[PDB]
Design a protein around this ligand. Structure first.
Ligand code: HEM
Ligand code: HEM
Ligand SMILES: Nc1ccc2ccc(CCNCCc3cccc(F)c3)cc2n1
Ligand SMILES: Nc1ccc2ccc(CCNCCc3cccc(F)c3)cc2n1
Ligand SMILES: C[C@H](O)[C@H](O)[C@H]1CNc2nc(N)[nH]c(=O)c2N1
Ligand SMILES: C[C@H](O)[C@H](O)[C@H]1CNc2nc(N)[nH]c(=O)c2N1
Ligand SMILES: [Zn+2]
Lengths: 411, 407
């Protein structure tokens, strides 16, 4: 069975067959759509089938399906699963793995870049100090002095679920949040809980509005350890505006490297619970969400006051005007300091080109419209008008529980 | 079984049970989500009729009363003989208000129970339908103080006798192709406009020409009618700060009145059921004005604002977009014509979801349609999880009458 999707601006219609290769469940049924819900030890039994499916896909992509090398690899992986209950990916399969997980990530608008992903193999790592070293290199290579390069570092895969590697941070670079006694928050409200776990673990907090958190790193199931990232490795950008001189006086900055460190990477049934990855920013992530979400830095009012808009009635659209101002400032500041960034018009146009290409070369592109459409100016980007089909392929990036809720403490 | 929805901005959590009363299907499967697809006999009629009367009687608190079982027998007999049945007035008003209540794509449902229902089931001809339509337009316009209403024509019987309004809205601007190659007026309505011209309409061929009504009674060829211009309230679009904005020569009409949907109540199909409320600002300023396939005026405005249009990253579109919408709101408010902004309408809708969760056990909502087409994340709906499901009575799409009719 085939499925068509229509772009309602261009009337271009595309035919999906890729959805047939999908297994994992979406969460919806014929009677209910869960398209807007934010969230979606494995046994030897369930493992060979998963490995086989992955190797069939790997060997197809390199035009060696059914080859002698294909059959021997399958034989060898099966022998390794029965003897040891798990197996080890070759380098090449890992690289292929990590690339396909990004390519398969239906909420990522940046997937046109999926095949340029520098993969660092940290599976020989055994200790939290080793993890810190691997993370510094990643950050140094990814940043590349403002000319960002996508990368991912992959720590040993899960074994019995009791020896897991985890990065306790949600991103490698993120600002502290502190709840004050009077109920206000200083710094970033999204990071208060984690900030508190750093303090308790012995971090001496500076207590400002923009303090880069320390790394909290768990090797082999052991209690996690604190490490400060060398500041010379943390590239940060002061935010100013090209026309409004008072903007600089709001004291805002952001860091340049967005580096998600809390997802789980699944490849051929193997689970990599520590797999930090990095790209570069679309401007709306910082300007709309980080700065203007009511539950984050929430600077809308302060900016509107300084612009002197009519804040007495919402129908003045003062909120909408202040928001476009902040986003202009964000992009202006990055471009001036020569730090890679993409605006939402350019990223969405890329994405539609990527999606057509994928329907042609691959037979489909899973895409999550709720996440792909940008959080400002949605209908003037071409993604608003594109029908999209969302389904789950592997390899994949998955959510996982916060480590502080599951970890057994040693003391 | 019972499902939770969380608001990520405020952490309010609501539990949904109403979905277990869903009848129709979504288009999704647990393998594929279809959230973003725009559109996905005597035997059948009795369960449908029964379902409907069951919730009607329970709503007025007489479920399983003499009166309940009485009506159930009665409609049961009428189906068995006539192979259809007629709704009582009160059931008809209940059905229509609930079709709005259940419209998961509608952000304006906090108003659902203030709907004026006009019963036109005694209508027989296109002139009759015209008369009902003007009464509806004048009542709902109310000289700028807008009132929700729906007018209900006779229900489908054999499908060769259908009542239909061929317009997609009762008030819509014409669209013409040109020698030039591109489009004067509204591109959305280029097709319908030629059916009118190929019908007899003399078009003024302007940018903002109110379309004639094309009305079909009992399956006959449809007939043109001009709406008295005195019943068409229109707003000149000016800006509270930019003097040159008035010289763009833009206007829009006060009354949004969708006329091409099908109302389904207790298995009965009402294929002509035009209804109207009032605008959210973004429908005109974001979609009608700035869609690439619509009036598409973003560059013309950006220009007049002397913004740097050299690269996408100056956010000149975003800048021009805001100014346009400020002007729509300003104009409607200055001319005393009811309008709602996206901040206000979404804050209401969150209040409505809350009400519905506690009084009904849920509220079907379609996030893709409820989040406004500008500034999504600074509105509270953006952060609200929503469950989408299909309840009846309902409004449904139906195919264009020109693809189906015979001359
Ligand atoms: C190269 C520049 C990139 C850009 C501009 C980009 C853009 C984005 C954006 C804007 C989002 C939504 C984020 C949000 O609203 O919170 C996203 C989601 C995501 N992207 Fe990317 N992306 C990039 C690179 C990458 C890389 C290198 C990977 C992994 C190798 C990745 C995997 C994902 C995943 C897994 C999600 C979904 C996250 C979730 O469900 O919470 N992306 N992408
Ligand atoms: C009173 C003021 C009202 C407001 C502000 C309002 C708001 C809206 C908006 C903004 C949309 C999406 C529009 C679009 O993007 O095309 C919509 C969809 C809809 N509303 Fe309303 N609404 C109102 C009254 C009504 C009434 C009176 C009814 C019927 C009694 C109704 C039924 C619907 C339906 C069926 C849809 C979805 C149509 C589709 O799937 O194409 N609404 N509403
Ligand atoms: N620019 C980029 C590049 C890669 C990315 C990869 C992943 C992400 C997503 C990280 N954000 C998670 C935020 C979240 C999600 C779900 C619930 C929450 F409370 C918070 C953003 C990215 N941005
Ligand atoms: N302000 C209001 C009030 C009631 C409304 C009732 C319905 C509507 C939207 C109806 N339009 C259908 C749009 C559509 C759908 C599918 C294909 C298309 F080309 C166009 C808008 C409303 N706006
Ligand atoms: C409730 C809702 O699904 C949730 O707020 C989503 C909406 N769309 C999103 N889209 C992106 N890119 N990022 C997000 O964090 C969200 N949040
Ligand atoms: C492809 C996508 O489903 C389509 O553009 C939808 C998106 N969301 C929408 N939301 C509203 N309110 N109105 C619309 O017409 C649309 N169009
Ligand atoms: Zn779905």
């Amino acid at each position: 069975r085939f499925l068509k999707v229509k772009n309602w601006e261009t009337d271009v219609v595309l035919t999906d067959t890729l959805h047939l290769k999908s297994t994992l469940e979406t969460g919806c049924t014929e009677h209910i759509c869960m398209g807007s819900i934010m969230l979606p030890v494995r046994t030897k039994d369930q493992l060979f089938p998963l490995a086989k499916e992955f190797l069939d896909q790997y060997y197809s992509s390199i035009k060696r399906f059914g080859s002698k090398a294909h059959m021997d690899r399958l034989e060898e992986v099966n022998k390794e699963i029965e003897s040891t209950s798990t197996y080890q990916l070759k380098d090449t399969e890992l690289i292929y793995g990590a690339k396909h997980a990004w390519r398969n990530a239906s909420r990522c608008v940046g997937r046109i870049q999926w095949s340029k992903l520098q993969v660092f193999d940290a599976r020989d790592c055994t200790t939290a100090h080793g993890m810190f070293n691997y993370i510094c290199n990643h950050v140094k290579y990814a940043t590349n002095k403002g000319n960002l390069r996508s990368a991912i570092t992959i720590f040993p895969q899960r074994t019995d679920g009791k020896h897991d590697f985890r990065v306790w941070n949600s991103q490698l670079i993120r600002y502290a949040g502190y709840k004050q006694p009077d109920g206000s928050t200083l710094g970033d409200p999204a990071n208060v809980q984690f900030t508190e776990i750093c303090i308790q673990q012995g971090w001496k907090a500076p207590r400002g509005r923009f303090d880069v958190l320390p790394l909290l790193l768990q090797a082999n199931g052991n209690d996690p350890e604190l490490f400060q990232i060398p500041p010379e490795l943390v590239l940060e950008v002061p935010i100013r505006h090209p026309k409004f001189d008072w903007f600089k006086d709001l004291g805002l900055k952001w860091y340049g490297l967005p580096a998600v460190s809390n997802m789980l990477l699944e490849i051929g049934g193997l689970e990599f619970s520590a797999c930090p990855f990095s790209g570069w920013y679309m401007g709306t992530e910082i300007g709309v969400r980080d700065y203007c979400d009511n539950s984050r830095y929430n600077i809308l009012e302060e900016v509107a006051k300084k612009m002197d808009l009519d804040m007495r009635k919402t129908s003045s659209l003062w909120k909408d005007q202040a928001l476009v101002e902040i986003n202009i400032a964000v992009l202006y500041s990055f471009q001036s300091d020569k730090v890679t960034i993409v605006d939402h018009h350019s990223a969405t146009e890329s994405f539609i080109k990527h999606m057509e290409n994928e329907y042609r070369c691959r037979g489909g592109c899973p895409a999550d419209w709720v996440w792909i459409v940008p959080p400002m100016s949605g209908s003037i980007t071409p993604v608003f008008h594109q029908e999209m089909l969302n389904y789950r392929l592997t390899p994949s990036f998955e959510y996982q529980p916060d480590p502080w809720n599951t970890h057994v403490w040693k003391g």
